[PDB]
Design an enzyme around this catalytic site. Sequence first.
Site, short mmCIF file in Angstrom:
data_model
loop_
_atom_site.label_atom_id
_atom_site.label_comp_id
_atom_site.label_asym_id
_atom_site.label_seq_id
_atom_site.Cartn_x
_atom_site.Cartn_y
_atom_site.Cartn_z
N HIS C 63 0.80 -1.23 0.00
CA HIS C 63 0.00 0.00 0.00
C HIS C 63 0.84 1.29 0.00
O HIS C 63 1.93 1.33 0.57
CB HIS C 63 -1.14 0.00 1.05
N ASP C 167 5.60 1.15 7.46
CA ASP C 167 4.28 0.64 7.08
C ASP C 167 3.64 1.68 6.13
O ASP C 167 3.11 2.69 6.59
CB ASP C 167 3.47 0.50 8.36
N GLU C 199 -5.16 2.01 2.02
CA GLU C 199 -5.29 0.83 2.91
C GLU C 199 -5.52 1.18 4.37
O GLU C 199 -6.22 0.46 5.09
CB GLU C 199 -4.05 -0.08 2.81
N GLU C 200 -4.91 2.28 4.82
CA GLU C 200 -4.95 2.64 6.25
C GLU C 200 -6.35 3.02 6.77
O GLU C 200 -6.59 3.06 7.99
CB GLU C 200 -3.90 3.72 6.57
N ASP C 222 3.06 -6.49 3.95
CA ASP C 222 2.79 -5.52 5.00
C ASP C 222 3.79 -5.79 6.12
O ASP C 222 4.52 -6.78 6.08
CB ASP C 222 1.34 -5.63 5.51
N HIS C 309 3.13 3.11 13.15
CA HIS C 309 2.08 4.13 13.21
C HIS C 309 2.46 5.29 14.13
O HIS C 309 1.63 5.81 14.87
CB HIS C 309 0.74 3.50 13.61
ZN LIG Z 1 -0.66 0.48 9.04
ZN LIG Z 2 0.21 -1.60 6.38
#
Ligand SMILES: [Zn+2]
Ligand SMILES: [Zn+2]
Lengths: 346, 346, 346
Positions: C63, C167, C199-200, C222, C309
């Site tokens: 992503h 990520d 995607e998030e 991922d 994150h």
């Molecule tokens: Zn993520």
């Molecule tokens: Zn991810």
Amino acid sequence: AMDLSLLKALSEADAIASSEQEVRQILLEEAARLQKEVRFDGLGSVLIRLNESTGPKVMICAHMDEVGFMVRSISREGAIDVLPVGNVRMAARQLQPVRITTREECKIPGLLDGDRQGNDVSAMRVDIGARTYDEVMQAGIRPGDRVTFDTTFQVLPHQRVMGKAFDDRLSCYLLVTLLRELHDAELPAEVWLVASSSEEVGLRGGQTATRAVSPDVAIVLDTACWAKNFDYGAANHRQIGNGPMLVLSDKSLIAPPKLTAWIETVAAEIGVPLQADMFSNGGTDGGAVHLTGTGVPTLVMGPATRHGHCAASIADCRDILQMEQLLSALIQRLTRETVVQLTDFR
Amino acid sequence: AMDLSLLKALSEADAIASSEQEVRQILLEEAARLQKEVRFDGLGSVLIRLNESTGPKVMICAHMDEVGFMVRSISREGAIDVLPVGNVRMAARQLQPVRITTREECKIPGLLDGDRQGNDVSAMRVDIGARTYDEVMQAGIRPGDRVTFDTTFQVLPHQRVMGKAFDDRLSCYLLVTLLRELHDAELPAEVWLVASSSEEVGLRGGQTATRAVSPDVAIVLDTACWAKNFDYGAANHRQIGNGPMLVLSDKSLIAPPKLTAWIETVAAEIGVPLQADMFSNGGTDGGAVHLTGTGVPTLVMGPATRHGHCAASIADCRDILQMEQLLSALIQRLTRETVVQLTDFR
Amino acid sequence: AMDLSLLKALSEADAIASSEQEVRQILLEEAARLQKEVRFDGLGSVLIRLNESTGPKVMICAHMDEVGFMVRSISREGAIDVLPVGNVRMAARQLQPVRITTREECKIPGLLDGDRQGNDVSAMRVDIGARTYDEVMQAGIRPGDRVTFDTTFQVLPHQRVMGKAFDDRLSCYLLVTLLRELHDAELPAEVWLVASSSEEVGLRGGQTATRAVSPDVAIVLDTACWAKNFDYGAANHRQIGNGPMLVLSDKSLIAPPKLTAWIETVAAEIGVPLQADMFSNGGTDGGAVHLTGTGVPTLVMGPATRHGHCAASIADCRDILQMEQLLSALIQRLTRETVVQLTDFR
Ligand SMILES: [Zn+2]
Ligand SMILES: [Zn+2]
Ligand SMILES: [Zn+2]
Ligand SMILES: [Zn+2]
Ligand SMILES: [Zn+2]
Ligand SMILES: [Zn+2]
């Protein structure tokens, strides 16, 4: 070699802020036996001049006083209200054997107990078995009398020792054995051995004694224990048997990196292992000392103990002997040029 | 004009109590370039004599150190335990980019994280991606290493700036620009520019540097922010763009009305607006300073900031220029008769 | 070798759901340079046909978007209200350096802060030093502008790297290096490299891109981190340096045992160690992807990271190189007969 009768005498002596005569007299007997001049500050701090030298003044400082209690009031039922002197652990304020020292220097044993509320224990009382105010008066007890844990100094297996007031009688012990070892030595520094008054109630004798001496460099001797006693992990740098502690910081002082690095190199030369420690809560007289006059290069060092500010602490004799060895070696290397080099900010 | 490269150098310098060499060297370079005499106290505070005068001694004081962390311990897994140095905001102790400076002056970037329990964040660790104790040792990292926020100095729109350590690097910046402006001026006072050591951990270098200088009057430069950042109401007297702050009181000092009145009249003459502020929570250099010797008439002033004791503060360039202008104007008016008038209690 | 300038470009690119142009352009430049056909879905997902083959269709999916914030509102005081885009860690919402990208592609740095109530942090605002609404308007800032952590990509000791958006920028990196390596290879499968949009914020670009490609098999790339960062025990299967992760299950997908067994046998052949992991809390591209049409045999793999994150994650370069090697080896072995064998339920 350990002098266990000296360590016993210091541990068992009862001395709190402003009433330190029991420790002072031991120190005074040692100095007189070696024909060493003793001076005092206004608080009664003992200032022992080790030698005469045109080299830099070095102060090695320990505190005479221990945490304890003070008689505050006597009830009509003969209960003896006390307040804590210094930070006595909250967990050391309940059902604890103690003794009270009167003005006539009599010692009356008793049991201390307090009311617990959550974390805190206050409203402490000592019981000597009295049933009236007058019975307490008859025992010679008065407001202001010192109260100390009723602990006999003891030897533990594997050359460890246990007793009250290891904070800071272990360091008073070191002052005396330094005096005994080095009294006739030719030294590159002028050494003052200082047993300061009243450290546990703040930063009191430390300040005044430092002003009276005016050192160029200062080594403050104090001890500490790790809260999690049997956690021998990498986070515990206060493990008995792992060598003297070099305190990098506490709430009152951040040690100067040049002095710290120098001591480490000396310890590595003589084979003394060091534990580099940081205090998250505690304060020493390191703080008041370095801020004296225009500033004194200062650090705190000492042997680790287990437990502290309670009826008994535990120390390792090897740690104590190694501190003795490191202090002596430092003193023998503290030349004018060394102390100039360790204070050059250009 | 603003010297942004100077402010960048000062903000980005990594300097905490007892390890202020990065800021000290900047100061030393400025003084040498203007052939100015530099002295030090025992803690490494930098004392710059601006001029020679038979008039009153004026000290202008800023602090060199910033809030940060110090390496305490390294685990078998390569986690680096740290403790805070100064009051780092609790909300600035979680998932923060940092860097560690070793004894060899290498800078290793990392991510700081802490364990939150309620308000408090403790048990802080820095992650440099290491998997073992020895990996951290190989990177040159040791107990005692300074740890600072990993912040690049940045220009904001409308002539404002953002960076770490604005407390108190904005004031160090002011010391330098005053030195640059006034190095050849004829002045009614003898001015000492002092960058003091170790303010964030107590009343430290302030006390010792003041004693070394023995001023007749002192201006302490420090900064503050308002807790409710976007409240531009009448209760916020720390608004950036609203002019330099004049601190009427803090926990450690209540400014002398005679001195604050005088400064207010000078600012009004030169057209510099002032924000009169009171600290309910904080202390400053001001407290230690005014209590030195038999007492020094002292006040605290400085540019307001937004945020503080975290990865980045924000300041307004106009505020900084106005403080510079007010400081210069005060110095030019500080005659013997002025400072006698402001200290007459009869 | 690692292409650190490529990883830097990808990590530092600012791209959130619906605004992924900074990552898309990097991808488009790589495909054009190798004269490769690029297609898009309706959301802007990038579909790169690696080769032409009559063998099974294989999709490799990463992503483009990162977790961040979006400008919601600007107050009369120049406060910039923002909302989170994706699951930003609660401990990453207080006193965080950020930057805002406007419609004119200017980048304005700022400090994000939020209001904490218990676990939750909400009412997030970004401060760019503005004092009015119009000041923010003048900077080009509008509702809808993307806000990302202000993180510079950094090399760590022992060949590890630190930066934002690992990520899923680590997986975008993998797409590019696979394209660079395999652009001229003869392969038993037709490979589609897909950088999916959004995607998030859910099952978004994954779903639509999968439909556009209609693969026979899918590998979703991922990353994940273990909540207890320095626990290297047997329960942590996301240790950096311990090899690529093979995800057995997450909230959105349970990988097919036949597919995981096959991959395990390929990794063991080429000497790539694998960490078999299960997500108890998280979902992935994997869920949406495998439920497309009549069902696609799908699994999730990728390099482990530390932290996630937030402003910065940490990854091990060896893990990344091993994933690259495992992906290439899987692709070279994905014959028609292999993918029929792995889908036979009779
Ligand atoms: Zn993520
Ligand atoms: Zn991810
Ligand atoms: Zn004590
Ligand atoms: Zn002590
Ligand atoms: Zn501060
Ligand atoms: Zn300050």
